[PDB]
Amino acid sequence: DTRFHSFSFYELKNVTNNFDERPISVGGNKMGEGGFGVVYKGYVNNTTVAVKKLATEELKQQFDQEIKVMAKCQHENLVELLGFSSDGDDLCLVYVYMPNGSLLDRLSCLDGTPPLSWHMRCKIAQGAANGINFLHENHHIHRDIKSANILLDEAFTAKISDFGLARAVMTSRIVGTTAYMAPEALRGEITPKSDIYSFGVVLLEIITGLPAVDEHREPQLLLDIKEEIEDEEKTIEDYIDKKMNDADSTSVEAMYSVASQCLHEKKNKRPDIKKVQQLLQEMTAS
């Protein structure tokens, strides 16, 4: 489709069963939730869509900024915005429906989905890196790269999502997700090098199948396994997701080497996204 649609609030309310907050499994419409708002499944113009209901003038400005960023950022590895609603009670954004949900939910097999093969994980890592490359080429810093923000379409093509914190340098309002954040981002710096660090945590989640933070785990933060492997207390083999049957040591170690480079403590020692893209291609190169 070739245009952004203005939707009525009542149409979005109607097609989401009055913004039914129950999960889809029990008969509801909720698909995702966070600080941004709630994402609901809807049906508009004989098509399934995702509706983000934003959770006053400052919120209207972030809504306008989100529309602006999505209108400029159209790429096969970015979620596509279809339309918006601002006439009624709440502000809504309508996106292309991602039938295979988030990479976080697919890694945890949420709702009974089969585990992702190593082959599919390599394709998703490459796709996500292609999306970040587009953002950085167009001078955008995502600021919240994480597996919950990597969505998957009908063909498991990776789509970077949630550009609510994106910026086109220091800040006094530090935003992002702690378990994925680079040390300089936690201190207030705004740099695309921080997105690279966060992508390195995503690569560890892909290799291990483990969440970035788990209170009932040692270590609690996934990024800390890099030190265990460097100090030879553990190997990458010990951490490889046992829910795969097709992982091979060579390609897993090649992905771990990229993740390790991304997780360098000094921002200038990290590879840029073009180099990450090159290394991920060499991993599967024939």
Ligand SMILES: Cc1cc(-c2nc(C(=O)Nc3cn(C4CCOCC4)nc3C(N)=O)co2)ccn1
């Ligand atoms: C925060 C955000 C989200 C979006 C967006 N989300 C979708 C979408 O379709 N999301 C999902 C769909 N399913 C399942 C599909 C299978 O059945 C259960 C829900 N999970 C999700 C999910 N975990 O977000 C499309 O755009 C855009 C901008 N900011």
